[PDB]
Amino acid sequence: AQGTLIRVTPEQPTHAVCVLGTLTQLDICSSAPCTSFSINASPGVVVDIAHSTWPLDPGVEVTLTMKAASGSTGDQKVQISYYGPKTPPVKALLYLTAVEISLCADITRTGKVKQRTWTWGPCGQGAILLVNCDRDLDSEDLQDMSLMTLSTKTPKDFFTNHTLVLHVARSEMDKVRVFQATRKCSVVLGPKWPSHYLMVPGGKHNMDFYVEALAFPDTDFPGLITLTISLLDTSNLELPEAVVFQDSVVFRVAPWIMTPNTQPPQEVYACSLKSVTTLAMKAKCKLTICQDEMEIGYIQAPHKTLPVVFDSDFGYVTRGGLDSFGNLEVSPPVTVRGKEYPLGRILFGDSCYPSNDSRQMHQALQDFLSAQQVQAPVKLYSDWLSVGHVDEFLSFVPAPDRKGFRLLLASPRSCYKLFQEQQNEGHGEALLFKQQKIKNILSNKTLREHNSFVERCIDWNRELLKRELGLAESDIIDIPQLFKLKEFSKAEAFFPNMVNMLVLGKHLGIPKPFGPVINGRCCLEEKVCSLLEPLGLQCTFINDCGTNVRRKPFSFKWWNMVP
Amino acid sequence: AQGTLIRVTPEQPTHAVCVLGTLTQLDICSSAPCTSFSINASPGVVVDIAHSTWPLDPGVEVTLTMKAASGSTGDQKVQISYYGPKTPPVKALLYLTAVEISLCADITRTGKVKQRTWTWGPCGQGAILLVNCDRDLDSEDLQDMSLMTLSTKTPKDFFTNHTLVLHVARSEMDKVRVFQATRKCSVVLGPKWPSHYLMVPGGKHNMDFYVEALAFPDTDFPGLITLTISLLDTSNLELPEAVVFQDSVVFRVAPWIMTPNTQPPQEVYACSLKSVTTLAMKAKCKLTICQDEMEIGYIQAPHKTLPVVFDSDFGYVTRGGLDSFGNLEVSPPVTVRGKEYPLGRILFGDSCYPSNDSRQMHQALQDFLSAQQVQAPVKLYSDWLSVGHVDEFLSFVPAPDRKGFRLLLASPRSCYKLFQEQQNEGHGEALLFKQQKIKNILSNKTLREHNSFVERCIDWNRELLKRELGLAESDIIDIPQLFKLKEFSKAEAFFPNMVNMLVLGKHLGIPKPFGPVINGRCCLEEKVCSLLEPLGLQCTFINDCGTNVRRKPFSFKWWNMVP
């Protein structure tokens, strides 16, 4: 393991402490007389040595390991006999005192307290801390926190000459807060003070501390917070305190995680019309009435997962229009050229390159999402849309076969083909919605070029999503949809944007495109179903849209990922 | 590689560009009639397809690759023949225009311009940028910068319908600056503007840009800066510009690197006595006269390495007493449990745990050194010394055998033994320097305890350095040295701190410890030589210390490391 080096002499005896679990090396030649030596000691001390030898080479390795906490000070002895030529010299005396000092937490992400660094994966190590989320003591308010325990086994009179201090680095104090459990609970470490003395009794004992995080990861906080325990010697009243042994635990603050439409819906919210309440109903989901300016995510720790709302028993964060959460989505779990993204991959749009007229999500948001590493953000292209949200051109719906989902991309092409197949059939006179006929729309050269330009933007995202999400054409479904360049050549929907749907599990709430009515049945409405129904989706069309959807957190534990 | 997807139809012909080096996929069924199809095209187009097949399955993969830049627009054709049952249908027409667009730099760290991400190591990829260091155009001022070249091979009339733009992300614009070489040089990308239009002529051409970094890595700058090139289509005067192809190069800003005493000295500096000029003389090193408040390091790029001074043709940085560069050192190259540290490992001291009376190096410095990753900083314990510099208890000198160096640690023990061996011999009356006799010093119980406490602090660093630098006792040498606790129980040297030496290569300038004179020869002075000389060091003692030492940069290229 790790440890110290003791120096013994024929001069006088040496007193020293040895913490169970550490490597105690012994320096024998330093103040030695005589050519060889012999080591004999108490039963509780296993004196192992290599090149138990007899020479006096300073290359000899004499390490001691104690087998258990002593009952009193100096229970174990180590006698160093120095002999040589034709003499029987001195015997160096060493009185050790073994103690047990374990600062331990839930390093095995299992909700139960049982290599000095935090490591990802299912075969990794490291306790986890949830950030404290609250807008404006005992278990009645400490189950959300992380338990850390300090157990000690030392001789009764041990803490008359040694004192334990618990500390955090000054650079991390403003990010954590530790509570001491008196078996009330008072704050011992925090933004205020970095260190604190523990009042610990000799013998077998152990106190509980409760830790919480005060900051999600961010551009200036990787997410690790370290708590160390120091065993200080204060046996000499004159000299200052001398650190005898340190040990620590490394916590990692849980990231904020977004939830994709492929997750079972748990609750829908709406603001002050009721096609949605009938939908949630069929969708086996709850429904409660009160604004799409926030996104419901979740933080998760072995001992507790907890919904957390993100705006600009619910947590909150407020980091801060491409600049709104309506331009924020998440792919479903996906694998790309090997690398596995179990929690999906966050999708948010902006522009191809920066200009005097380029919009983008505020840099403080982008940097934040990236800081949570677990869903490695992907920049799409949406700046081409008047409003600018990626939801205006994409969507994800649950599938029952391939990868388990399907990418829906708006598609002007799929609509011209549909209106064309419609004209050929003799319905070129059908009215959409001024109200234009399916043939004027088709003959409109100007409208045609516009969509042709939109096809380009969406197609550019088709390839982007294909690369970053590792998708295949077989994972994509083009939904017939038209567009029109209005404001500053920016794009708007030429009719209810259907790909801007409320995916509530397996039941979809799609905007009704009052399109060309054939056989008393809108062709678009009809086409959309012939694309989704064979997948199991239940298409229902509504008219207009303020809604949010709290969804079920991934069974997969974010910390088992391997970013 | 990476690329686009073209949609052809029997309707009309499709025109499109294809950049050499990209994957051009073809969508055939989208607007197809008829059950099978056939693909035939110009000689310059290698039409490869898999399940050249005949079916009409949307699972068929038809990719095109051009063999070379076209001479005019639409030099290559691709004819899609759609046939089936008992019919001979349409032939879809496609006119492609191949162009060459390579934005390339020195991705092979070789000083010569020849996977879209920056990677470390000897088998890695990624150009390197030096930060601009200057205190207060042509090659006369552009050899320190990094060359980036844009080569193009397109038909003469090509840029009448397409325009190239060079950009940096807004989040990195304030960290880079790009100059355009007109074959004067003017700024095109920088803290001011993120994008810029290139005025590029059709045919074969290539322009040079010169890049420089304006910020070393830091807690808010990992060190990567990305420059992308966009090929925009502006063939339709109505619609906005449409990105056709993007490519980029990823630069990494050179870290600031510190130089250990094991490096050959190149120049010593001193401020307004001359034992040092005689020393540099024997040391085969230059010498120039004018303050130890700065540290001379270096930045290094394949095309140029350049000395850079660090304070609070020389570069400068000013990030901002444990808080001074006198508490800053660097181990020599060393290997620890496998992990290799070729540029050494930065050593800087502070305290064991944070207190009301703990000192430490300003957090902005610590964070800075870490940001340069190349020399992964190690925190030692020095807060116990009145002044607080790690140089007061350690030093590194060049060795000719083992790892190539030797760790020198001050050692009160090595001095008591030496003064004791001296007393036994009958010199217990020798005067040190009030002037105390070698026996009063030895009998002094209070002085003895003090040093005993210092032994503890140094011994705690002995184990720290052993672990982090992977040292062995055989790599350490205790220099006899005494201490005394004065100011607030803080430590000071009980006689010229010898381990605070000016290692000028193989020639050492050690503080003279006017110690007990035996045989007309100070015992300490004598002991120090019997420890160093057999290693090749030339010990010379001076009396007191303002000096700095610019040293030779490691032959090893920092970017070949693997942090």
mmCIF file of N, CA and C in Angstrom, chain A residues 2-5 7 25 30 116 165 167-168 170-171 194-195 197 219 230 232-233 236 238-246 352-356 360 363 413 417 449-450 453 455-456 459-460 462-463 466-467 473 485 489, chain B residues 2-5 7 25 30 116 165 167-168 170-171 194-195 197 219 230 232-233 236 238-246 352-356 360 363 413 417 449-450 453 455-456 459-460 462-463 466-467 473 485 489:
data_model
loop_
_atom_site.group_PDB
_atom_site.id
_atom_site.type_symbol
_atom_site.label_atom_id
_atom_site.label_comp_id
_atom_site.label_asym_id
_atom_site.label_seq_id
_atom_site.Cartn_x
_atom_site.Cartn_y
_atom_site.Cartn_z
ATOM 1 N N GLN A 2 0.463 2.259 0.819
ATOM 2 C CA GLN A 2 1.165 3.543 0.970
ATOM 3 C C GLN A 2 1.501 3.767 2.466
ATOM 4 N N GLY A 3 2.585 4.495 2.762
ATOM 5 C CA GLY A 3 2.932 4.707 4.161
ATOM 6 C C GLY A 3 4.175 5.490 4.569
ATOM 7 N N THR A 4 4.745 5.107 5.712
ATOM 8 C CA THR A 4 5.901 5.802 6.280
ATOM 9 C C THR A 4 7.192 4.980 6.458
ATOM 10 N N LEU A 5 8.240 5.651 6.936
ATOM 11 C CA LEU A 5 9.554 5.049 7.176
ATOM 12 C C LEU A 5 10.036 5.460 8.576
ATOM 13 N N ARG A 7 12.773 5.386 11.797
ATOM 14 C CA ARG A 7 14.210 5.344 12.043
ATOM 15 C C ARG A 7 14.483 4.928 13.477
ATOM 16 N N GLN A 25 7.767 1.178 6.533
ATOM 17 C CA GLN A 25 9.143 0.807 6.225
ATOM 18 C C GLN A 25 10.018 1.171 7.432
ATOM 19 N N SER A 30 20.794 3.908 9.365
ATOM 20 C CA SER A 30 20.917 5.330 9.688
ATOM 21 C C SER A 30 21.740 5.706 10.921
ATOM 22 N N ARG A 116 -8.210 5.705 -4.679
ATOM 23 C CA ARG A 116 -7.846 7.068 -4.281
ATOM 24 C C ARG A 116 -8.204 8.050 -5.414
ATOM 25 N N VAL A 165 -8.610 15.709 11.782
ATOM 26 C CA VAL A 165 -9.200 16.863 11.137
ATOM 27 C C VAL A 165 -9.739 16.410 9.772
ATOM 28 N N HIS A 167 -11.029 17.732 6.067
ATOM 29 C CA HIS A 167 -10.912 18.910 5.212
ATOM 30 C C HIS A 167 -11.228 18.731 3.731
ATOM 31 N N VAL A 168 -11.413 19.865 3.060
ATOM 32 C CA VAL A 168 -11.677 19.914 1.632
ATOM 33 C C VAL A 168 -10.685 20.952 1.193
ATOM 34 N N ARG A 170 -9.430 24.381 -0.468
ATOM 35 C CA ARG A 170 -10.083 25.675 -0.536
ATOM 36 C C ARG A 170 -10.759 25.857 -1.886
ATOM 37 N N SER A 171 -10.182 25.256 -2.925
ATOM 38 C CA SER A 171 -10.720 25.381 -4.283
ATOM 39 C C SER A 171 -12.000 24.600 -4.514
ATOM 40 N N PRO A 194 -12.819 25.331 5.278
ATOM 41 C CA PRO A 194 -12.260 24.171 4.583
ATOM 42 C C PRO A 194 -11.857 23.005 5.475
ATOM 43 N N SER A 195 -11.612 23.281 6.753
ATOM 44 C CA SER A 195 -11.206 22.232 7.678
ATOM 45 C C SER A 195 -12.003 22.247 8.971
ATOM 46 N N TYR A 197 -12.053 20.145 13.134
ATOM 47 C CA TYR A 197 -11.549 19.144 14.069
ATOM 48 C C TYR A 197 -12.668 18.218 14.520
ATOM 49 N N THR A 219 -17.765 24.528 -16.860
ATOM 50 C CA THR A 219 -16.464 24.859 -17.451
ATOM 51 C C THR A 219 -15.355 25.105 -16.461
ATOM 52 N N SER A 230 -7.179 13.745 8.232
ATOM 53 C CA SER A 230 -5.784 13.781 8.677
ATOM 54 C C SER A 230 -5.674 13.371 10.132
ATOM 55 N N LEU A 232 -3.288 13.861 13.062
ATOM 56 C CA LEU A 232 -2.192 14.722 13.517
ATOM 57 C C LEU A 232 -1.667 14.330 14.896
ATOM 58 N N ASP A 233 -0.359 14.435 15.051
ATOM 59 C CA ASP A 233 0.299 14.125 16.306
ATOM 60 C C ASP A 233 0.446 15.448 17.051
ATOM 61 N N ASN A 236 3.818 16.598 21.514
ATOM 62 C CA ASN A 236 4.770 17.593 22.002
ATOM 63 C C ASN A 236 3.962 18.884 22.045
ATOM 64 N N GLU A 238 5.179 21.758 22.656
ATOM 65 C CA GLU A 238 5.978 22.845 22.100
ATOM 66 C C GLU A 238 5.895 22.953 20.577
ATOM 67 N N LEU A 239 6.352 21.906 19.901
ATOM 68 C CA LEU A 239 6.348 21.860 18.447
ATOM 69 C C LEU A 239 4.920 21.936 17.858
ATOM 70 N N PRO A 240 4.785 22.313 16.574
ATOM 71 C CA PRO A 240 3.422 22.355 16.041
ATOM 72 C C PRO A 240 2.940 20.929 15.707
ATOM 73 N N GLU A 241 1.686 20.796 15.300
ATOM 74 C CA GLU A 241 1.138 19.485 14.997
ATOM 75 C C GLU A 241 1.773 18.879 13.750
ATOM 76 N N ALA A 242 2.009 17.575 13.807
ATOM 77 C CA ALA A 242 2.649 16.877 12.705
ATOM 78 C C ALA A 242 1.734 15.829 12.103
ATOM 79 N N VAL A 243 1.420 15.965 10.819
ATOM 80 C CA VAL A 243 0.560 14.979 10.162
ATOM 81 C C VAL A 243 1.220 13.592 10.172
ATOM 82 N N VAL A 244 0.486 12.609 10.683
ATOM 83 C CA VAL A 244 0.966 11.241 10.788
ATOM 84 C C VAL A 244 0.423 10.340 9.693
ATOM 85 N N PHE A 245 -0.787 10.623 9.237
ATOM 86 C CA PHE A 245 -1.406 9.802 8.219
ATOM 87 C C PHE A 245 -2.621 10.483 7.612
ATOM 88 N N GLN A 246 -2.739 10.418 6.292
ATOM 89 C CA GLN A 246 -3.883 11.011 5.615
ATOM 90 C C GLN A 246 -4.499 9.969 4.717
ATOM 91 N N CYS A 352 -24.291 27.117 -39.319
ATOM 92 C CA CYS A 352 -23.125 26.460 -39.889
ATOM 93 C C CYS A 352 -21.832 27.180 -39.530
ATOM 94 N N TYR A 353 -21.797 28.489 -39.733
ATOM 95 C CA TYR A 353 -20.622 29.259 -39.371
ATOM 96 C C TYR A 353 -21.111 30.579 -38.740
ATOM 97 N N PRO A 354 -20.290 31.220 -37.896
ATOM 98 C CA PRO A 354 -20.693 32.478 -37.246
ATOM 99 C C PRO A 354 -20.663 33.749 -38.120
ATOM 100 N N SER A 355 -21.741 34.532 -38.051
ATOM 101 C CA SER A 355 -21.893 35.763 -38.844
ATOM 102 C C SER A 355 -22.444 36.935 -38.040
ATOM 103 N N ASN A 356 -22.700 38.037 -38.739
ATOM 104 C CA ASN A 356 -23.263 39.234 -38.111
ATOM 105 C C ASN A 356 -24.729 38.918 -37.839
ATOM 106 N N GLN A 360 -27.412 31.593 -32.145
ATOM 107 C CA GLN A 360 -26.803 30.434 -31.528
ATOM 108 C C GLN A 360 -27.333 30.357 -30.117
ATOM 109 N N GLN A 363 -23.607 30.828 -25.179
ATOM 110 C CA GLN A 363 -22.458 30.007 -24.891
ATOM 111 C C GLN A 363 -22.470 29.380 -23.495
ATOM 112 N N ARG A 413 -39.868 17.059 -50.035
ATOM 113 C CA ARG A 413 -39.919 16.085 -51.119
ATOM 114 C C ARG A 413 -41.098 15.121 -50.962
ATOM 115 N N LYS A 417 -44.163 14.749 -53.861
ATOM 116 C CA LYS A 417 -44.464 13.434 -54.413
ATOM 117 C C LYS A 417 -45.921 13.064 -54.090
ATOM 118 N N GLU A 449 -38.733 26.344 -55.295
ATOM 119 C CA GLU A 449 -37.326 26.651 -55.044
ATOM 120 C C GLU A 449 -37.069 26.794 -53.553
ATOM 121 N N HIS A 450 -37.969 27.487 -52.863
ATOM 122 C CA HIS A 450 -37.866 27.663 -51.423
ATOM 123 C C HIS A 450 -37.676 26.290 -50.759
ATOM 124 N N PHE A 453 -34.573 24.648 -51.210
ATOM 125 C CA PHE A 453 -33.502 25.188 -50.376
ATOM 126 C C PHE A 453 -33.599 24.602 -48.963
ATOM 127 N N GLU A 455 -34.826 21.650 -48.276
ATOM 128 C CA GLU A 455 -34.444 20.253 -48.439
ATOM 129 C C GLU A 455 -32.949 20.133 -48.169
ATOM 130 N N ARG A 456 -32.228 21.147 -48.628
ATOM 131 C CA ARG A 456 -30.781 21.249 -48.488
ATOM 132 C C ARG A 456 -30.363 21.350 -47.019
ATOM 133 N N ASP A 459 -31.386 18.139 -45.270
ATOM 134 C CA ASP A 459 -30.519 17.064 -45.772
ATOM 135 C C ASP A 459 -29.121 17.154 -45.186
ATOM 136 N N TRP A 460 -28.723 18.371 -44.832
ATOM 137 C CA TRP A 460 -27.412 18.598 -44.251
ATOM 138 C C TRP A 460 -27.443 18.095 -42.816
ATOM 139 N N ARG A 462 -29.514 15.656 -41.962
ATOM 140 C CA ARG A 462 -29.735 14.227 -42.124
ATOM 141 C C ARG A 462 -28.378 13.535 -42.065
ATOM 142 N N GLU A 463 -27.406 14.093 -42.785
ATOM 143 C CA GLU A 463 -26.062 13.534 -42.798
ATOM 144 C C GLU A 463 -25.340 13.744 -41.474
ATOM 145 N N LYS A 466 -26.758 11.342 -39.075
ATOM 146 C CA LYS A 466 -26.343 10.004 -39.502
ATOM 147 C C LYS A 466 -24.942 9.696 -38.949
ATOM 148 N N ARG A 467 -24.040 10.665 -39.072
ATOM 149 C CA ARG A 467 -22.677 10.509 -38.598
ATOM 150 C C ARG A 467 -22.558 10.435 -37.061
ATOM 151 N N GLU A 473 -30.200 4.868 -43.180
ATOM 152 C CA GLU A 473 -31.436 5.313 -43.798
ATOM 153 C C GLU A 473 -32.610 4.522 -43.258
ATOM 154 N N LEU A 485 -40.170 30.505 -47.180
ATOM 155 C CA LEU A 485 -39.214 31.474 -46.667
ATOM 156 C C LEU A 485 -39.911 32.829 -46.564
ATOM 157 N N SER A 489 -35.736 35.681 -45.447
ATOM 158 C CA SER A 489 -35.480 34.405 -46.108
ATOM 159 C C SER A 489 -35.435 33.230 -45.129
ATOM 160 N N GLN B 2 -16.420 11.091 -45.470
ATOM 161 C CA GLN B 2 -17.627 11.820 -45.053
ATOM 162 C C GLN B 2 -18.210 12.581 -46.271
ATOM 163 N N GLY B 3 -19.531 12.796 -46.301
ATOM 164 C CA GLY B 3 -20.106 13.495 -47.443
ATOM 165 C C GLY B 3 -21.607 13.737 -47.561
ATOM 166 N N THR B 4 -22.088 13.764 -48.804
ATOM 167 C CA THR B 4 -23.491 14.058 -49.093
ATOM 168 C C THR B 4 -24.302 12.962 -49.813
ATOM 169 N N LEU B 5 -25.588 13.241 -50.023
ATOM 170 C CA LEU B 5 -26.523 12.331 -50.689
ATOM 171 C C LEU B 5 -27.306 13.119 -51.751
ATOM 172 N N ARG B 7 -30.107 13.454 -54.898
ATOM 173 C CA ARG B 7 -31.398 12.912 -55.309
ATOM 174 C C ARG B 7 -31.636 13.188 -56.782
ATOM 175 N N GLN B 25 -23.152 9.895 -51.827
ATOM 176 C CA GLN B 25 -24.175 8.860 -51.916
ATOM 177 C C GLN B 25 -25.263 9.345 -52.884
ATOM 178 N N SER B 30 -36.293 7.618 -54.531
ATOM 179 C CA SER B 30 -37.067 8.791 -54.122
ATOM 180 C C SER B 30 -38.117 9.321 -55.099
ATOM 181 N N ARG B 116 -9.536 14.770 -37.961
ATOM 182 C CA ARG B 116 -10.507 15.830 -37.675
ATOM 183 C C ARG B 116 -10.479 16.163 -36.170
ATOM 184 N N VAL B 165 -15.617 30.585 -47.132
ATOM 185 C CA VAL B 165 -15.519 31.391 -45.933
ATOM 186 C C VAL B 165 -14.671 30.613 -44.915
ATOM 187 N N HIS B 167 -13.645 30.341 -40.914
ATOM 188 C CA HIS B 167 -14.161 30.751 -39.611
ATOM 189 C C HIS B 167 -13.617 30.024 -38.385
ATOM 190 N N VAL B 168 -13.867 30.624 -37.225
ATOM 191 C CA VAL B 168 -13.477 30.071 -35.939
ATOM 192 C C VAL B 168 -14.761 30.197 -35.172
ATOM 193 N N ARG B 170 -17.178 31.396 -32.203
ATOM 194 C CA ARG B 170 -17.158 32.620 -31.424
ATOM 195 C C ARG B 170 -16.469 32.387 -30.089
ATOM 196 N N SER B 171 -16.589 31.169 -29.563
ATOM 197 C CA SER B 171 -15.997 30.828 -28.267
ATOM 198 C C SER B 171 -14.486 30.691 -28.295
ATOM 199 N N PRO B 194 -15.294 36.438 -36.257
ATOM 200 C CA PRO B 194 -15.195 34.979 -36.302
ATOM 201 C C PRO B 194 -15.151 34.368 -37.696
ATOM 202 N N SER B 195 -15.650 35.099 -38.689
ATOM 203 C CA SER B 195 -15.664 34.591 -40.054
ATOM 204 C C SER B 195 -15.122 35.591 -41.060
ATOM 205 N N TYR B 197 -14.671 36.094 -45.675
ATOM 206 C CA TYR B 197 -14.795 35.583 -47.036
ATOM 207 C C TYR B 197 -13.449 35.603 -47.744
ATOM 208 N N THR B 219 -7.794 27.068 -16.992
ATOM 209 C CA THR B 219 -9.023 26.453 -16.481
ATOM 210 C C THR B 219 -10.241 26.640 -17.349
ATOM 211 N N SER B 230 -15.586 26.729 -45.225
ATOM 212 C CA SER B 230 -16.899 26.363 -45.763
ATOM 213 C C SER B 230 -16.997 26.726 -47.231
ATOM 214 N N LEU B 232 -19.699 27.493 -49.805
ATOM 215 C CA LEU B 232 -21.109 27.882 -49.908
ATOM 216 C C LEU B 232 -21.575 28.039 -51.354
ATOM 217 N N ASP B 233 -22.804 27.619 -51.597
ATOM 218 C CA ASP B 233 -23.409 27.718 -52.912
ATOM 219 C C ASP B 233 -24.213 29.014 -52.917
ATOM 220 N N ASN B 236 -28.272 30.601 -56.607
ATOM 221 C CA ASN B 236 -29.618 31.170 -56.654
ATOM 222 C C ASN B 236 -29.471 32.515 -55.952
ATOM 223 N N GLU B 238 -31.892 34.438 -55.209
ATOM 224 C CA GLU B 238 -33.011 34.627 -54.293
ATOM 225 C C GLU B 238 -32.797 33.992 -52.919
ATOM 226 N N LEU B 239 -32.659 32.672 -52.911
ATOM 227 C CA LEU B 239 -32.455 31.920 -51.682
ATOM 228 C C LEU B 239 -31.144 32.314 -50.961
ATOM 229 N N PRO B 240 -31.031 32.022 -49.653
ATOM 230 C CA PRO B 240 -29.770 32.388 -49.004
ATOM 231 C C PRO B 240 -28.674 31.365 -49.362
ATOM 232 N N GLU B 241 -27.449 31.615 -48.921
ATOM 233 C CA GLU B 241 -26.348 30.723 -49.241
ATOM 234 C C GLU B 241 -26.492 29.373 -48.546
ATOM 235 N N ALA B 242 -26.136 28.320 -49.269
ATOM 236 C CA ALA B 242 -26.262 26.970 -48.745
ATOM 237 C C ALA B 242 -24.912 26.289 -48.632
ATOM 238 N N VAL B 243 -24.534 25.894 -47.420
ATOM 239 C CA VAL B 243 -23.254 25.208 -47.235
ATOM 240 C C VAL B 243 -23.233 23.882 -48.012
ATOM 241 N N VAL B 244 -22.211 23.720 -48.846
ATOM 242 C CA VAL B 244 -22.051 22.534 -49.672
ATOM 243 C C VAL B 244 -21.036 21.555 -49.108
ATOM 244 N N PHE B 245 -20.027 22.075 -48.425
ATOM 245 C CA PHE B 245 -18.989 21.227 -47.878
ATOM 246 C C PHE B 245 -18.132 21.973 -46.868
ATOM 247 N N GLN B 246 -17.834 21.323 -45.750
ATOM 248 C CA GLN B 246 -16.994 21.936 -44.733
ATOM 249 C C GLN B 246 -15.876 20.981 -44.399
ATOM 250 N N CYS B 352 -0.339 20.779 4.423
ATOM 251 C CA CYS B 352 -1.016 19.493 4.444
ATOM 252 C C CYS B 352 -2.528 19.641 4.330
ATOM 253 N N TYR B 353 -3.109 20.508 5.147
ATOM 254 C CA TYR B 353 -4.538 20.748 5.071
ATOM 255 C C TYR B 353 -4.760 22.265 5.241
ATOM 256 N N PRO B 354 -5.877 22.802 4.729
ATOM 257 C CA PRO B 354 -6.153 24.244 4.841
ATOM 258 C C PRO B 354 -6.629 24.753 6.217
ATOM 259 N N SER B 355 -6.023 25.848 6.679
ATOM 260 C CA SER B 355 -6.330 26.446 7.989
ATOM 261 C C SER B 355 -6.454 27.965 7.944
ATOM 262 N N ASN B 356 -6.624 28.558 9.122
ATOM 263 C CA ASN B 356 -6.727 30.014 9.244
ATOM 264 C C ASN B 356 -5.318 30.556 9.036
ATOM 265 N N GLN B 360 -0.418 29.054 0.849
ATOM 266 C CA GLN B 360 -0.528 28.221 -0.330
ATOM 267 C C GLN B 360 -0.198 29.094 -1.517
ATOM 268 N N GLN B 363 -4.332 30.251 -5.996
ATOM 269 C CA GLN B 363 -5.030 29.272 -6.791
ATOM 270 C C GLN B 363 -4.917 29.497 -8.301
ATOM 271 N N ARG B 413 19.269 14.783 10.605
ATOM 272 C CA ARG B 413 19.877 13.539 11.063
ATOM 273 C C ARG B 413 21.330 13.412 10.598
ATOM 274 N N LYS B 417 24.579 13.047 13.288
ATOM 275 C CA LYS B 417 25.494 11.919 13.151
ATOM 276 C C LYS B 417 26.912 12.442 12.871
ATOM 277 N N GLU B 449 14.832 18.649 19.579
ATOM 278 C CA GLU B 449 13.414 18.386 19.340
ATOM 279 C C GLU B 449 12.937 19.117 18.096
ATOM 280 N N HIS B 450 13.348 20.374 17.956
ATOM 281 C CA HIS B 450 13.001 21.172 16.791
ATOM 282 C C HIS B 450 13.353 20.387 15.518
ATOM 283 N N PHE B 453 11.369 17.569 14.710
ATOM 284 C CA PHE B 453 10.076 17.915 14.127
ATOM 285 C C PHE B 453 10.244 18.217 12.632
ATOM 286 N N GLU B 455 12.548 16.881 10.735
ATOM 287 C CA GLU B 455 12.842 15.584 10.137
ATOM 288 C C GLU B 455 11.531 14.971 9.660
ATOM 289 N N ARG B 456 10.501 15.188 10.467
ATOM 290 C CA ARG B 456 9.151 14.698 10.218
ATOM 291 C C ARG B 456 8.553 15.316 8.951
ATOM 292 N N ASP B 459 10.657 14.221 5.987
ATOM 293 C CA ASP B 459 10.420 12.786 5.780
ATOM 294 C C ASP B 459 9.064 12.528 5.146
ATOM 295 N N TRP B 460 8.131 13.441 5.394
ATOM 296 C CA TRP B 460 6.793 13.323 4.844
ATOM 297 C C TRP B 460 6.864 13.669 3.364
ATOM 298 N N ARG B 462 9.672 13.171 1.681
ATOM 299 C CA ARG B 462 10.517 12.115 1.141
ATOM 300 C C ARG B 462 9.606 11.030 0.580
ATOM 301 N N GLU B 463 8.586 10.665 1.355
ATOM 302 C CA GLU B 463 7.637 9.648 0.923
ATOM 303 C C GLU B 463 6.739 10.144 -0.202
ATOM 304 N N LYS B 466 8.757 10.151 -3.277
ATOM 305 C CA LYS B 466 9.029 8.754 -3.623
ATOM 306 C C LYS B 466 7.849 8.180 -4.424
ATOM 307 N N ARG B 467 6.636 8.450 -3.952
ATOM 308 C CA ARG B 467 5.433 7.968 -4.606
ATOM 309 C C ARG B 467 5.170 8.620 -5.979
ATOM 310 N N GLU B 473 15.174 4.778 -2.517
ATOM 311 C CA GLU B 473 16.154 5.349 -1.612
ATOM 312 C C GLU B 473 17.480 5.538 -2.322
ATOM 313 N N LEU B 485 13.276 26.413 14.831
ATOM 314 C CA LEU B 485 11.935 26.973 14.750
ATOM 315 C C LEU B 485 11.947 28.347 15.417
ATOM 316 N N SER B 489 6.841 29.204 15.348
ATOM 317 C CA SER B 489 7.256 27.808 15.254
ATOM 318 C C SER B 489 7.611 27.391 13.825
#
